[PDB]
């Protein structure tokens, strides 16, 4: 009985009874984050611990609790100083109260009867609120506000933003701190219901049919709820909250022995930082993981849409705002599917024709938060690569679009803007490469000088760097030099007695834009460079800290970094920091094309030649 | 009636028959490349054909225009190869390095010293390229290296002869050198990838995936090779220099058929090694110029090469006596799922909406001696045109030096793969709209904290227009997201904003060769990565129409001189995009597949989304 297993919905139920028993659990206390902790290193009987982040609806200070679930007790219980260390991710149940005290406030009201908006008609977003020169929200849990108009039930609100106001909400004393008008912006008019008929126009007739089928099933079994055995491969699919999809335990069978390459893999934040310096927009960074908590809005996805081929689903787990176990019901797609051309060669000296297909194993979820939709695919192929994508979609974020234009600002459709923004992932791998004993080279390719032993001056080579301690394990991109970076393990050799590797290759994006002396730099300070290397260590689990609603900055890596620990043969863990920078098009709107970013992983001397001999013709 | 056409076999026959005629075609003659010309801008029909005529006897040889339609020969001018370069080199001549070497004393001597049967040495026919040698200027050389083959169906890459190379006139059939530079062990490990021994039981745990369409693919093919599909219209080409070629690429945006790319295709492609020993640091292969990679082409085996409903074209290319030979099922065509398209749920509508993508993809496969590469021209719903180059095959060896080398890396015992660059270049003649376009490069801008920005967070972006040839050769900035707009200003979006083209390059490392080499001047369009010309019809190739043993002189850096208007012109671009390849261990002893690309995506083309007519599945 695995104990990376998935949490089961006895389990949720057990830890709202522990918390019960002990006393943490009323009524006016309400569950804020709540997942299984991953085991220790080196236990492995099991003791299934979970860590839980409870508010409090009656104003009193939130606590953080880890439970026992194997032995029915309390762990640990401490009080939070939310001024000091960050106010709990937002609840769901908020999500509505921006919009409902707005409909009462009169400085709210006048608003509107300016602009002549319905008041029922004007939905409000919950906005994460960030900390910037408002002295008065320093310990107070607040969401910020921005209007759009919905005509009617089933209207697309986003076509309709209400530029020049915002509002900022108290959403534990259900206070509003201040309404902001800078003035009236014509309300953009143009619908964007993408499934009305008159948009759309009349829908194709010339698609048809692709069929995806495997008639003897699929070539990954699923024992234990969630360990995956696949064409070499072994893992643990996990979920949580916040992460959503987390991956353990990857490794390959090379031969007889199963070997080791990433212990944890997952993405541990993603912000959303927007580049409009209008004071109505300025505030605006949605850290969609670390505030909102991505795993808990995961779709359910549909059979022959979402998820094409034959699919193996897994329904996950979470605790709803009270304790109570609810299931995303197929929430994780699991399936296999063709990659083309694996390798071929036709050669002419022996008379062989040589052809294999490729294929890829495909773990995701998809989540929805507010307007943006988000897929996260997680592929492993045939030959040790591993890939993760991001697939970006939903609706874009407007704004009005300004007469005379916008530095900072895209028109989508006659009086519609779209602020731009940026979208940033930081994937945290846990690197066990043959084992925990790992280090990180920078490797840049390196230019060489025409002259003596290069007389045609057609050398070229490549240079690594061994990164040694924490100090110098920050690093930038440098696509021109073709820069990567290899995870090796200095005591596992290669038949050919080269330490065995994995090599990192980015896309090589833009990394954070805003101004180095922002707020957001400071929040999210991994977003201004690509990699990072740490130490392990039990508590560094985000890059953004564990609260990063309305935390002032500097939390996570950088105060992790700071301890300057050994990285040169050590547990280690790898922060990949990658995104897309979203100028929005005409094309994105109504409904925005999916757009895509990743970073991959492919084996460097780990193997003692290619690990696909093996592979049968088709 | 599409003067875009396939050649037919009819055509080529005709060519051969046209050239006899006119006395250009005698038995000491021999077509080394033999295409169709694309119609004049504005053009009823004439299809006009392109030859280079080989002479065995060792006359200059010919560039010779033909129309078929009209059974005349348009053109026939003398090369002087010394000056323009050397033809491409000839299929038949492959075999001439071995055969030639085999009773040579020098090169027997050098096997003997080795203790190597010289029925057994394979000897690869290298380009020769153009260095100190005075005497091989003017002359057909090929350059050979040796891979011993133990036995008829033995892998001779496992095996390679280091510290030894022969050059050879392949015209006059001497042996011009033979080097030896010291003997290095011959790795003895076989690379035999079918042998049960090195592969181990095959694996019993693959399942079927069964990929098929009831009712047919959702594109059509007219006319031989016009290709309608989603919107999309295109003609699929092939050409035995380039291989596969797209022409009038457009979209059809409700009643208007849109051009967005008059020509697209891969005009060279270069593989430059990094080793600097004297038995290889002369190696760069131009497999498109030199070689010419479409007439390599596989054949695709149903099932194998391509899995789905397939539609084959069976193009037809002129063998080295004018005769018309077809390349069965060498191009691949079929339309696959693509993931998801579009999704959202919206909590205040509680529309829940999500709908498919899909791709139609165009590709050939061919090989050129331990290569193989496949081309991949994807079209898909939203708009976007994207290229892929697939790399495998056999990576090219060398002995591994005891003591370890800066420039070659261990595989197996004693075997190495010199570091190389595979580097494509793609040309683009434009279309945005039509033929006045325009190009601009585009940067993130980054803002600081003050006035106007006082909490730091405002990012912009600018666009600077290339207007004249002079300013128009751009390098990558990847730091600032550096992509490069094609636009028509004439033609405006219902938004009155110039309708694009974005290309999103994947900002791969150019030619890492010094600039004062050779390579850097024969492959100078590899060392930046954008390019953008005015359109002529002799600017085909960015390193000239004869590469082989040509130094510099042509091809790009002459366009580009000429400093033409590119502001609201006809416009080609050339991307320049390559894989930097340092061989790994899992590379051996067969590659898996490696990739490199680009992609242009439309901005400000449409009015909206172009995929909201997109049914649920
Ligand atoms: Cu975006
Ligand atoms: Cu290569
Ligand atoms: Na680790
Ligand atoms: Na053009």
Known sequence: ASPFRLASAGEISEVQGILRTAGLLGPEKRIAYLGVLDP?????????????????????????????????????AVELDTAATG???????????????????????????????????????????????????????????????????????????????????DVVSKEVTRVIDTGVFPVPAEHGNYTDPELTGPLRTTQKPISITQPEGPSFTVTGGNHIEWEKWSLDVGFDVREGVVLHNIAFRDGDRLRPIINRASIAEMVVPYGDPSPIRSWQNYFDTGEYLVGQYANSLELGCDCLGDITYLSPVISDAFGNPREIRNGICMHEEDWGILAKHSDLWSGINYTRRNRRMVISFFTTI?????????????????????????VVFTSA??????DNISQLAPGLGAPFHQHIFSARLDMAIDGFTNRVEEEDVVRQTMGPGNERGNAFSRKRTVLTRESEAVREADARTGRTWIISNPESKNRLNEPVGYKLHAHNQPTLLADPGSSIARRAAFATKDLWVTRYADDERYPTGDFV???????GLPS????????????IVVWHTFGLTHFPRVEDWPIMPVDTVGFKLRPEGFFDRSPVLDVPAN
Do not use: C, M
Not at 401 to 406: A, D, Q, R, T
């Open 560 to 571: 992790y970094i700071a301890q300057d620990r050994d990285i040169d043969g050590q547990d």
């Open 370 to 394: 507010g307007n943006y939709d988000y897929g996260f695919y997680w592929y492993l192929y045939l030959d040790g690569t591993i890939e993760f994508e991001a697939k970006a979609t939903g």
């Open 40 to 76: 220790a290193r080196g236990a492995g009987a099991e003791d299934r611990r979970f860590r839980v982040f409870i508010h409090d609806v009656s104003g009193a200070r939130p606590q953080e609790v880890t439970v026992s679930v194997t032995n029915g007790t309390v762990i640990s």
């Open 87 to 169: 106010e709990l991710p937002v609840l769901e149940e908020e999500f509505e109260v921006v919009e409902q005290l707005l409909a009462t406030d009169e400085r709210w009201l006048k608003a509107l009867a300016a602009r002549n908006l319905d008041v029922s008609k004007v939905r409000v977003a919950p906005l994460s609120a960030g900390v910037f020169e408002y002295a008065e929200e320093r310990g107070r849990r607040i969401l910020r506000g921005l209007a759009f108009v919905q005509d009617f039930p089933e209207d697309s609100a986003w076509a309709h933003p209400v530029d020049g106001l915002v509002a900022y909400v």
């Open 549 to 555: 609603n309305q935390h002032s900055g500097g939390a």
């Open 401 to 406: 679009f300004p007469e005379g234009g916008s």
